[PDB]
């Protein structure tokens, strides 16, 4: 009922046969750095080339796939993370 944004789950939009509208919502805590999308084709002797997109563009488009073919994809999230060592118990006698 106020300012309390939880973790947003990934979602897909503009889905096609040879193209898809991959979209994700980065976490305010998640480091803001360009991400890399990896894709692998099974109906080809060689996989499709990856792509690098800035973090600001939580969305990206990948076309050139083939229908009826098994395409292996992988969404890797590379982020540094927030400052570690928040609050814990300090050892002391």
């Amino acid at each position: 009922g106020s300012e309390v944004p939880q973790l947003t789950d990934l979602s897909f939009v503009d889905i096609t046969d040879s193209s898809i509208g991959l979209r994700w919502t980065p976490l305010n805590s998640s480091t803001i750095i360009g991400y890399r999308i990896t894709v692998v084709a099974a109906g080809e002797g060689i996989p499709i080339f990856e792509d690098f997109v800035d973090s600001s563009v939580g969305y990206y488009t990948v076309t050139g796939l083939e229908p009826g073919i098994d395409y292996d994809i992988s969404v890797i999230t590379l982020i540094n993370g927030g400052e570690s060592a928040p609050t814990t118990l300090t050892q002391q006698t």
């Binding site: 979602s11 897909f12 939009v13 889905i15 395409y71 992988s74 969404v75 890797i76 999230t77």
Partner: peptide, 26 residues
């Protein structure tokens, strides 16, 4: 809005990665 198909998050390799069968089905 409801999507044709949706998977889930998987914890592995000391990292969070999203994987599944293949591209968006139907």
């Amino acid at each position: 809005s409801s999507s044709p198909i949706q998977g889930s998050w998987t914890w592995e390799n000391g990292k969070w990665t999203w994987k599944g069968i293949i591209r968006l089905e139907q």
